[PDB]
Amino acid sequence: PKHVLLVSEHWDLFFQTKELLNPEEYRCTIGQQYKQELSADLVVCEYSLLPSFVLVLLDFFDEETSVDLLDRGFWYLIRPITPRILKSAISLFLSQ
Amino acid sequence: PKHVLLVSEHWDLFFQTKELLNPEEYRCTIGQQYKQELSADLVVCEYSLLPREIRSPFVLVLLDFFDEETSVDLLDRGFWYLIRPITPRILKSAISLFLS
Ligand code: NA
Numbered sequence: 001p002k003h004v005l006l007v008s009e010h011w012d013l014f015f016q017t018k019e020l021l022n023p024e025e026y027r028c029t030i031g032q033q034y035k036q037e038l039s040a041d042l043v044v045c046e047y048s049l050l051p052s053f054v055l056v057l058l059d060f061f062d063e064e065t066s067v068d069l070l071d072r073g074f075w076y077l078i079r080p081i082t083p084r085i086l087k088s089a090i091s092l093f094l095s096q
Numbered sequence: 097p098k099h100v101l102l103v104s105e106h107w108d109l110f111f112q113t114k115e116l117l118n119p120e121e122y123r124c125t126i127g128q129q130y131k132q133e134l135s136a137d138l139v140v141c142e143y144s145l146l147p148r149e150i151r152s153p154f155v156l157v158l159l160d161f162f163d164e165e166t167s168v169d170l171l172d173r174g175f176w177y178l179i180r181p182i183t184p185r186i187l188k189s190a191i192s193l194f195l196s
């Protein structure tokens with residue numbers, strides 16, 4: 001099982017997403033801070049909490065923010081997001 | 097070099113993006129309709145020009161608006177997307193992200 005670390009202040013979205021992922025293919029850890037101490041195949045992380053592969057969650061679009069994330073090698077999703085969207089992005093990313 | 101196919105009815109964004117790409121690393125083609133015909137490393141396609149029946153088996157789809165079902169549908173078909181607003185800098189960095 002691929003290891004997925006999900007970092008955010010709030011956890012509803014992430015709990016629901018975890019319930020949606022196949023438990024034989026993905027194992028989730030949830031945090032309120034990006035602990036670079038934890039090994040993970042993919043980190044999903046709120047932008048405000050950003051210090052492996054990382055998918056960044058943004059509240060709003062901003063060109064310079066977006067350009068910098070992509071140059072650093074991070075894909076991003078801009079709100080609004082749903083558990084189904086986040087589950088599908090995690091699957092797509094890990095399978096690719 | 098990598099091959100990027102660009103499918104759109106409004107070519108200005110794409111024109112400006114090619115100008116920013118290093119021509120020794122990337123060769124571009126731009127069209128108004130989606131051709132499975134061409135082999136490319138990455139396809140950037142406007143959603144309105146994306147055939148409904150296709151999926152993969154890189155494709156980046158460009159959306160005007162957010163719609164949840166549409167976003168879930170694209171990701172399940174194996175396509176990443178970008179919602180507007182979009183700029184040439186954003187497009188260039190995305191292309192490089194995928195192909196690096
Ligand atoms: Na499921």
Ligand code: NA
Nearest residue numbers: 018021022023
């Ligand atoms: Na699960």
